[PDB]
From a paper:
The construct AgsA:DelC formed only 24-mers in solution. AgsA:DelC, differing from AgsA:DD only in the N-terminus, formed 24-mers similar to those formed by M. jannaschii Hsp16.5 (MjHsp16.5). Cubic crystals of AgsA:DelC in the I23 space group diffracted to 4.1 Å resolution. The application of crystal symmetry on the MR solution of a dimer in the ASU yielded an octahedral 24-mer, similar to the assembly of MjHsp16.5 and S. tokodaii Hsp14. Though the search model lacked both termini for both protomers, successive rounds of refinement yielded clear density into which we could build the C-terminal extensions of both subunits. These termini containing the IXI motifs (residues 143–145: Ile-Ala-Ile), bind in the hydrophobic groove present between strands β4 and β8 of a neighbouring dimer related by a crystallographic 2-fold axis. As observed for MjHsp16.5 wild type and its N-terminal variant, this AgsA oligomer is also charged on the outside and hydrophobic inside. The C-terminal extension in the AgsA:DelC construct forms crucial interactions to enable its assembly into a 24-mer. Constructs possessing an intact N-terminal domain (AgsA wild type and AgsA:DelC) were better at preventing the aggregation of chemically denatured lysozyme.
Residue numbers in the entry:
A (entry chain B), B (entry chain A), C (entry chain B), D (entry chain A), E (entry chain B), F (entry chain A), ...: 40 to 145
Write the structure that this text describes.
Amino acid sequence: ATPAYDLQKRDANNYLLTVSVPGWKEEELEIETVGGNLNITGKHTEETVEDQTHWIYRGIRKADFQLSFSLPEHAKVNNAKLEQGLLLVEIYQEIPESEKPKKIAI
Amino acid sequence: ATPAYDLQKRDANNYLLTVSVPGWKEEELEIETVGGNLNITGKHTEETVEDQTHWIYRGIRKADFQLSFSLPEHAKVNNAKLEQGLLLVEIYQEIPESEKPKKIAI
Amino acid sequence: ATPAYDLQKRDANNYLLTVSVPGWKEEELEIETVGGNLNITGKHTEETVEDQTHWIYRGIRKADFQLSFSLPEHAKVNNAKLEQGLLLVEIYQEIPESEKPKKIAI
Amino acid sequence: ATPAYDLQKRDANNYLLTVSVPGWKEEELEIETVGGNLNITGKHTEETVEDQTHWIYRGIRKADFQLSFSLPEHAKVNNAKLEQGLLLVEIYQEIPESEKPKKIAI
Amino acid sequence: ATPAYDLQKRDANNYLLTVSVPGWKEEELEIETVGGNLNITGKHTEETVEDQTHWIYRGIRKADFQLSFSLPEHAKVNNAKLEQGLLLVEIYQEIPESEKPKKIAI
Amino acid sequence: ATPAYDLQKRDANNYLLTVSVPGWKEEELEIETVGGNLNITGKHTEETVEDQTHWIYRGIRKADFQLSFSLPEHAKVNNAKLEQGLLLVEIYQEIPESEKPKKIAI
Amino acid sequence: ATPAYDLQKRDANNYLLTVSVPGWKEEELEIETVGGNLNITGKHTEETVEDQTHWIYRGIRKADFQLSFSLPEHAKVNNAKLEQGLLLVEIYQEIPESEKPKKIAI
Amino acid sequence: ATPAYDLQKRDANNYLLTVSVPGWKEEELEIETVGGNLNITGKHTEETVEDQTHWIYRGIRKADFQLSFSLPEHAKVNNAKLEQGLLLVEIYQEIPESEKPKKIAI
Amino acid sequence: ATPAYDLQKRDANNYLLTVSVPGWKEEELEIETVGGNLNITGKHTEETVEDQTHWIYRGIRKADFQLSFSLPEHAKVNNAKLEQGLLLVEIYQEIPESEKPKKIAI
Amino acid sequence: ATPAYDLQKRDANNYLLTVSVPGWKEEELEIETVGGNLNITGKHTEETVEDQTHWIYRGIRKADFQLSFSLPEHAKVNNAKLEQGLLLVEIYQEIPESEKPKKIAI
Amino acid sequence: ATPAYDLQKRDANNYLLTVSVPGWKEEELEIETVGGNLNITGKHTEETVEDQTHWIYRGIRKADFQLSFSLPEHAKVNNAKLEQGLLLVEIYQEIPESEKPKKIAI
Amino acid sequence: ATPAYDLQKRDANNYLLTVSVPGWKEEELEIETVGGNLNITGKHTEETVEDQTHWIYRGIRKADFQLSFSLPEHAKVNNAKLEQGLLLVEIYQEIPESEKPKKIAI
Amino acid sequence: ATPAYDLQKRDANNYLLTVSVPGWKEEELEIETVGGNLNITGKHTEETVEDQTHWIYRGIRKADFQLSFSLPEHAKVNNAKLEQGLLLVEIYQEIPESEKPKKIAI
Amino acid sequence: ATPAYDLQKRDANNYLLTVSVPGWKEEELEIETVGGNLNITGKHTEETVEDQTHWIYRGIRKADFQLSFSLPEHAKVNNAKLEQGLLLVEIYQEIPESEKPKKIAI
Amino acid sequence: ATPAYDLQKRDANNYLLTVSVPGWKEEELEIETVGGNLNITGKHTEETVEDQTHWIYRGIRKADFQLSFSLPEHAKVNNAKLEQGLLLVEIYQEIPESEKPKKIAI
Amino acid sequence: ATPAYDLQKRDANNYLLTVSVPGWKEEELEIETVGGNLNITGKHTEETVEDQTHWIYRGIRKADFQLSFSLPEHAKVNNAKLEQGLLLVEIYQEIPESEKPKKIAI
Amino acid sequence: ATPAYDLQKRDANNYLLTVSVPGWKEEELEIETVGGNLNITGKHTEETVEDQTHWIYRGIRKADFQLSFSLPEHAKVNNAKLEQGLLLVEIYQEIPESEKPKKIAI
Amino acid sequence: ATPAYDLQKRDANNYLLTVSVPGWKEEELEIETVGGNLNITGKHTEETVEDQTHWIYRGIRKADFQLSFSLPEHAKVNNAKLEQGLLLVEIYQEIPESEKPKKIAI
Amino acid sequence: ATPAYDLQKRDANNYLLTVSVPGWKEEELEIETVGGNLNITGKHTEETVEDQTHWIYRGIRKADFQLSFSLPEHAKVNNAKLEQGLLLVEIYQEIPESEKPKKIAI
């Protein structure tokens, strides 16, 4: 079971990844950039004896996980903010020497 | 698409509801108490046309919704607190003048 | 075959039932409130020799029927109007001593 | 979803169409005579956003529509009268100078 | 269940319809010519309490019915005779200004 | 293809057979009493070649046939009358010196 | 749907038929002995407008019916009593000149 | 095998149960009122070994049984009368101080 | 595998049985009339070492057999001739005191 | 489970029934002659509770039973002898004054 | 339907064909020798209309037919004899100057 | 089995029918013009009994037949010529005073 | 494979056909009005050796074709313009002496 | 996997629950009465390294569990004894003001 | 698709092949006798641009083809005539020194 | 097909085999003890021409057979008696030096 | 239904059987040692008729039974102790003078 | 629904894309060059509500869309010309300094 | 999942077992000889937190296990060497007093 995720392009220079991580905390998330690939890794730090007597129902599941995504050379990350249960990660890279849309003919 | 939810019962007089609500603004959320029944209604306040060309992938779902639960008399809500995209709703009550958890004989 | 029917809530104090009854007349409909249940009953008063020679096609069917619906204690009916082939029945009851929607926390 | 309809023929020169149209306003309805063909077009003039939370149940359908029938020459419409949600449309004509319904021999 | 029926052409000017109507009587059959169509209609005039104690077996069924057949303009009926359980109806019309079969070539 | 048939029993000593025989000439029909058994044999006396081009439709069937029924001793035939294409055959007998239809006690 | 029925032999001279006929009355049942066969016939004498409003549920069905059973020559009926919803019919006949069970050998 | 049963409701305060119980002796029958619930228990008091050689056919079933129904407060039984193998049980009650069966408006 | 057989009626007094018995001989066939039943019995008298080397193909099979047929009282056999591989057996009995075919009515 | 049985016919006047009845005591067996019909009824007189722990295997079946056969008039039983667990029952009769087993012609 | 046939080979120079032909007249039969091939053609000379009412059963088949067999050079027919409904056809030939059936060594 | 047919249209006023009719004699063929409809009726004038022994193979079919086509007013037949087993039938007409095949604009 | 096509009504006097014909040229399209029917016909004028070496992929197919559509009497074509790969054909006809939509009653 | 369980009624005032709990100990079982519901909860207190080398086979499984059962108001528990691997729990409540079974009528 | 074909034997000396070849011409058919085999070969000499605009329907297909048939040594062809769309080819060969049909025996 | 068989233990020292062998005789059964295995062998000594004419029906089958059963060392047979179609064989062996059932603990 | 069982082996000379036996009285239980084989036979000493009306639910099964296990020589039983519904049976033995669990080399 | 497209490659340095875009306005079309990738995005600028009553048929599809293709370095677009509803897009490039198409040896 | 294993016979006195145990160590393997059976037992001594971040892929699985094999009396083990991931175990036993292969005859 993996957390929901989206990717948008702010521009040719921009990728933005949005991941749903409810209950996920500052200490619980660690990320690494290795060999042109970005890895986003969740870990539940520890277990708590959960009284199955205490809870009648659970529909919400979280699991430790790692996500891997190949990054185009040569990429730079702008910011990562966790707000409203959302992980927003800003990533910058560009200059293929073509941003330019143009034509018309007849 | 409906949000996953967990419900905890702390004691004979109290249970706790846990709802995953990522990306949701308090401004998007409304709650109602009617006839001993709790209705939780999410409303996305407004939408913005986004060019799907700019969005490469969407795994994350957004929808307006309503949930309903009949609560036994006589109910009072303690707190509903939103943190890191989760809604925790405190519910405390009971009085049938019996809590008593004991016996064995022979 | 039963007539189409809808139910809306004007407020906690209000239920509104809308039933489609084309061709249904003042004398043809009788309703009764018994044991906390509302019964809406149609009866075709009588038969008319119908010349099957006279009509080539019929798509519209009506049948004698009774509808039964359990009413929450302790209910009162406001009005019932038959207009434009519609049966509109206004029903009032309330005061669980909770109309009140409220909360926010953090 | 299309409305059930009945068609009656009173005589060699006359038939009658019966349409179920509950909740419909005359203001919502348009009829057209074109090329010996009758077109009956319902149009819901406008809609109102209704919160489905307020509506518990809908069995009753609402839609804009058009119906078409080629009518043999030479047709004239007598009346279309709307009562208790039904549309009765009067159609009278024929002249092939032959009505004659009789014979037997041996 | 409909009675057996046949159609023969005596000539370009002639159609002959033969229908099996055992037990069918002078009063029981009525026919009508309307709008270029011929209708042949059976009616059992009435019911007779039939003692199901009186009859052990029945293989022969009769039912009230109407038959409709589009007639080419401009048609005239010659005779209808009921004999030996047979309905024979003679119908005349002609003069397309071609009765004429002819050719040979090489 | 065999003709539909009905059999009526008027009393302990009498039953009546009803046969549908449209288009049949008495000249086409033969009956036989052999060994307490009744044999009803239809024979179409002769056929005429008809050009199927002149006949557009045939729903009506014509065939030679024989029917057989063992009748309990001691049988005598009263009448067989042909009217409007139906054959009614009268059969009267019995003598086990017992007709008696009655009793109840307690 | 036919009423439950049983047959027992009191002796070589005796048959006893037991039929369940709840709600069946003195006037409602008529029996006849004809041609060595016994017929037991129920008839509901008449209909009563039954208010389908008056009854919510019926599991018990009764229908008009006739039962026929071939009787060995030469049979005599002793008694028929209706008691506790039961139809008991006593029937006597005998004397094949063998009642006699006997043998042993070696 | 359980007995067919019918239930009639004579009025807002009264309903009637109809049970088919052929061959049953009052001595075989027991009824019980416990917690607002009616239990109807048939008990065949005793059995007699019957030689199945003497019994040629059994269509009629015999079994001990119990039936249960929760009855809304506050119930009182009027009569249970056994006639011609049927048990009719009278049940009368209600008091929510509302019988009122009327309205229409416009 | 049984030999082909046919039965014809020469008259009410006559039955004729024809059985195919190729290779069947005078000594090989024996018949018996017992208890109103006729039995026709074939027996291959003996075996002959058959050289399976001598014959490449056989399509014709014969087997020892017995045929049994219930004869109406009180029957007499006229003649049995074996000719051209055919068994022809003539059987006479009659006089139900009905040979007589007759009727016509109207 | 019913016993295998063989039936032999020694002559036109006599047939012999062979029944396998191992472990059966003559004391367990009863025979009856009723209405020209033979009934053979085995009855195990009594059973003894046997501990299935002491019995490792049972392939052999034991049951009470009744068999029935209609015998044509006029029947007399000669002998029924039980030897080495088999019941042989002698049956001799006939007199239609015809035994005659012969003819052939040409 | 084709007749069963057997073929026997008496020696290297001779084989024998056996055909079942019951009811066949020599007058019905024709044989032909063409191109070293034998053709056996049965022809039923003529038919007689038989009333199927007089014939109760037919198991025996009658049809005209032709059979063909290529025979190796150089063939001569010895005899074809018809007895008790069987056709035996004698065929003798061969000369490849080799009959010799022997050897073994080591 | 019906003959393959081709239909050619030479112009707005003319179409040509092509029928394959091998082995057919003009003497076998009849054509008819009735009510603006063309009927083409083949009739094999007579048949000759052919011994199927003389015929080794038949792939070629022979049957009497009729074909029908409604032709729009106002039709005249030009020629029907039979050559090398094909029937070519010339049909010329039209006059709605419009042939005109042209336009394009911008 | 046929080109996409649409039909709209500008009024009772108007039909407009829109066909997609990319790559279709002035010389390539020819239309004809014959017998009340309009035919729109494409023809690729000629072939060009297409180097299958020159093109790696083709998703767009064009084929020679003809479209036929029955035109109501008595029709006139206004204009046909090929613009933006679109064929727009304007067609006029009218005057059934009914353009008139009207009614309301009660 | 849950332990086997039974429920008996000693009287209107009595329920008795019997649960099979082999190996279950004094410390291992805890029960609680909360909100009109009784919960019976097993817990294995701890784990013991089980040598899978030590045991070749186990057919008996025990698991930690909780059972929940809604109790009618207003209930009292008498005794709970663990004997012979059985959990017996006595529960008392009553006085609907009907213990009373009674009736007979006619 | 191959043309229909038949083969008949005029005598032992004769084969006759009949092939349907409508539209097939003098120049279009060529035949060859090679190695004891006869080959009949059709060729459409050439193609004609066929206006698919000119013909609405074709049911008749012709294709170039070759037929091959092994001829018994030593064969001679008499005549080949194309008449009425028929190819008739006369072929002679004989003298196996057996034309002779003969036998009868007993 | 093998005869029914049972095995019981009279004690640790005892096995008893019971086999059903109806019609089986003193001379017909031979048994042998070989290599610790007991073999029970039936043989029908000889055949008797059985007239299939003499018997109409046989349900009882017997076949020659041998049964083999491994015997525990070191076994001794007590007695074998054939009575009432039963083969009873007494077999003794024992002394594992444990006959002894005992224990109780706590 | 057979009881779940576990078997433990404490050492080379000893294994332990664990049986679940809830509700069982020692008085109900019997054990036997025969031929090195252990037989455990439960016997419910007697039953009491319980009214299933008093018993609302039964999940718990009660049956008499026997279990068998061949035990290798030379076996002795240590103890069988019943506690909290479990039977633990101690079995100790072996002497093949080899326990030795060790080696490794290279 | 996506538009059919063809792609042509004129030479090692050049390929041509062919897109079908009927009814499309240049004003509706946008193209983009990003990261060596070509994106072709159609956008219908705006829509007009059309009454589907006026439109009898739609086979022609209209939708906004985006297409994407990674183009190998180093790409430059020559022309994109729209004619008669087709978009032809010119793409020229390559320089791996190798075009050479030749050799053969031996 | 169990490790691959092979068994070879060096001679009548010899068995050799070869087991694949990659990664298996001196401390990890323990074997025991008990009751004529050899047990080979693997145990992973302990767990190591394995970083699932550290390893992307594993195809090689090892599990704790025990193997059991019945040894013929009276067996002796020679050597066990772990080399190249192989477990080689030498086992000796012999002297059935037959090693001897011999024979030829005629």
